[PDB]
């Protein structure tokens, strides 16, 4: 398999900087590799053999060190909201409101171009009150995961309220019911923690997952999570188990102590579960990405001059369609 070459949307023009570009070997000219967050599509390629500078948040740096064994000497964690000079360039990391340690990166280029790379983010009104507020941003590298008008979904808070009210009612109807959530990466902690909290329980999980959550600076985490599954009413399983076979199979462990499973999994408030026997799976629209409305609001507020989409950029047609939305957002706001 021939190593691929770093595409342009991961390069910061005229700098020696790349963002989330670890799977291409030595990128020619790259002197500093930024990692926006610890999701595998973004970190793919990093390992103990990576020997160029990696800039990232402190949570991401802990994860690089402890899970991927990146050598400490190449990990450069930067605090949020604070100007840092990197190979002569002024950079600022901001909270992306995505998963723990996820950042957006503000680059002040020598030539006066100001660039915002959102990494993955879920656009919030609070970003309109950050450092972004101060100077003009010319070029925006935008997380366009849900850059389509049909992508609507409630706030995280509405989804979590649905989830805790559902779980509560479920265990009131059956004290021997088990609540399950799936995971395959960091993020979405707020969902299983709010469930566990409403059930007065800790979240039961594997040794591996318990260690990962230690890297995340979640206040009093050890009081909320546990590896003793049999003591907990909320279990966290691999996403691949969240299906009737995996769940029927989990119900046979802990010695048949539980006789029903209620499971939550993200889609693909006001939802129909799939039910087979004593297993129910609710697909809930919990998202760590901007909805189409959230994205449009943020961009109309930021008023950038050029937008480089970084998701769903696999076809010309898709790239053009996004550009067309962006041009419509300009026409409508005026900028
Ligand atoms: Zn992500």
Give me ligand 1 centre to Cα 102, in Å: 8
Give me ligand 1 centre to Cα 37, in Å: 7
Contact 130, 106 (CB under 8 A): no
Give me ligand 1 centre to Cα 122, in Å: 10
What's 280's domain CATH number? 3.40.50.12650
One domain, residues 131 and 205? no
Q: How was this structure determined?
A: X-ray
What DSSP character marks residue 299?
A: H
Cβ neighbors of 262 (< 8 A, separation 6 or more) are 166, 167, 170, 177, 178, 179, 180, 280, 282
CA distance 88 to 2: 34
Give me ligand 1 centre to Cα 120, in Å: 5
What SS3 state is found at 247? Answer: helix
Number of domains in the chain: 2
CA distance 86 to 241: 43
Give me ligand 1 centre to Cα 198, in Å: 27
State the DSSP string of 122-168: ---GGGGGSGGGTS---EEEE--TT-STT-----HHHHHHHHHHHHH
Assigned token pair, 120: 């993955």
Contact 73, 4 (CB under 8 A): no
Assigned token pair, 143: 């997380």
One domain, residues 13 and 23? yes
Domain that holds residue 326: 1-151+290-335
Give me ligand 1 centre to Cα 195, in Å: 23
Give me ligand 1 centre to Cα 106, in Å: 18
CA distance 174 to 185: 30
CA distance 327 to 322: 9
**Domain end call among 289, 305, 322:** 289
Resolution expressed in Å:
2.2
One domain, residues 128 and 48? yes
CA distance 35 to 21: 8
One domain, residues 140 and 7? yes
What's 294's domain CATH number? 3.60.15.10
Q: How far apart are the first and last CA of the chain?
A: 45
Cβ neighbors of 286 (< 8 A, separation 6 or more) are 156, 159, 160, 163, 188, 191, 266, 267
Burial of 252 (0-12, 13-18, 19+ CB in 10 A): exposed
Give me ligand 1 centre to Cα 144, in Å: 12
What DSSP character marks residue 11?
A: B
Burial of 49 (0-12, 13-18, 19+ CB in 10 A): exposed
Give me ligand 1 centre to Cα 39, in Å: 5
One domain, residues 10 and 122? yes
């Amino acid at each position: 398999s021939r190593k691929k070459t770093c595409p342009f949307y991961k390069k910061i023009p005229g700098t020696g900087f790349t963002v989330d570009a670890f799977q291409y070997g030595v990128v020619e000219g790259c002197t500093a590799y930024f990692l926006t967050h610890f999701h595998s599509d973004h970190y793919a390629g990093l390992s103990k053999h990576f020997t160029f500078p990696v800039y990232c948040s402190e949570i991401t740096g802990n994860l690089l060190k402890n899970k991927l064994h990146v050598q400490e000497q190449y990990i450069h964690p930067l605090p949020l909201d604070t100007e840092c000079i990197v190979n002569g360039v002024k950079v600022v990391l901001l909270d992306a409101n995505h998963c723990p340690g996820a950042v957006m990166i503000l680059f002040y280029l020598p030539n006066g171009t100001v660039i915002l790379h959102t990494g993955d983010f879920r656009a919030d009104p609070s970003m309109e009150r950050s450092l972004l507020a101060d100077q003009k941003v010319h070029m925006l590298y935008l997380d366009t995961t849900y850059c389509s008008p049909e992508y609507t979904f409630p706030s995280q808070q509405e989804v979590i309220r649905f989830a805790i009210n559902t779980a509560f009612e479920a265990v009131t109807l059956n004290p021997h019911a088990l609540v399950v959530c799936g995971t395959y990466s960091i993020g979405k902690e707020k969902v299983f923690l709010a469930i566990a909290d409403v059930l007065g329980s800790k979240v039961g999980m594997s040794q591996e997952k318990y260690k990962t959550l230690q890297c995340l600076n979640i206040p009093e985490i050890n009081s909320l999570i546990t590896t003793d599954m049999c003591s907990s009413l909320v279990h966290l399983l691999p996403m691949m188990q969240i299906n009737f076979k995996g769940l029927q199979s989990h119900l046979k462990k802990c010695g048949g102590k539980y006789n029903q499973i209620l499971a939550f999994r993200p889609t693909g408030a006001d939802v129909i579960p799939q039910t087979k026997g004593n297993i129910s799976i609710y697909g809930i629209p919990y998202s760590e990405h901007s909805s189409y409305l959230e994205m449009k609001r943020f961009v109309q507020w930021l008023k950038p001059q050029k937008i480089i989409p970084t998701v769903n950029v696999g076809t010309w047609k898709s790239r053009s369609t996004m550009e067309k939305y962006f041009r419509e957002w300009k026409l409508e706001a005026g900028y």
